[PDB]
Amino acid sequence: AGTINKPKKPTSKRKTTRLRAKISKRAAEKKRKERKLARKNPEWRSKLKKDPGIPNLFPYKERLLQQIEEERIRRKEEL
């Protein structure tokens, strides 16, 4: 495009008070609306979220798993 030699009308980054108030009002209304939809939401949700786990690049993951086995065997023996 010939933008450099012949630029067009600039787009103003200067806001207006009416537009700011309207945007704030519509944002608050959308927040209330999504709160209502979250209250009336029919979607199934798990009681416990799926935990991501231990990263593979962590160097001490294997010794941490060794520990985790040690506390599970210790708890099984204590119980």
């Binding site: 991501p52 786990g53 231990i54 990263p55 690049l57 962590f58 160097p59 001490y60």
Partner: protein, 174 residues
Amino acid sequence: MGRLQEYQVIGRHLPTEANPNPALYRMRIFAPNEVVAKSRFWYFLRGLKKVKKATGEIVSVNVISEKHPLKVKNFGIWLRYDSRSGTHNMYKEYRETSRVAAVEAMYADMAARHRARFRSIHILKVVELEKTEDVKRPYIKQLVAKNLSFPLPHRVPKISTKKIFSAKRPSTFS
């Protein structure tokens, strides 16, 4: 997230007639002061063991100082951070002289690279890498290289901002 210290915070549930000797829970908290350390402690036990502040007490708060603050160390930090997608695991490495310095650099790094605030970051593990072969990231592997040496090209000289005018043009070679 500021000048932090590592605190050992031990707390418990208040003793009752049924349970006269309740169990004690210890955590390591990176916090600017003791009030924030105890608040974060009660936050984490509210999230984990369903123990509240009103029904519990703090048994001990101690400062964990670094054993060798004058030794350069490599630190691996396993963390989880919350974004608009959800919770993500990250493993990162920091070459520092103390655990608190590593955690401060971690907080600044996540703020710079992912816009994650203090409230959305959970520090799950901070470890010192015992061996050089334990280093995973290239930006620490280049620093632990044998016979490391480099120059400093294009150094801007320190000139006082109150000295407005100079009679000679500065050089960037030393």
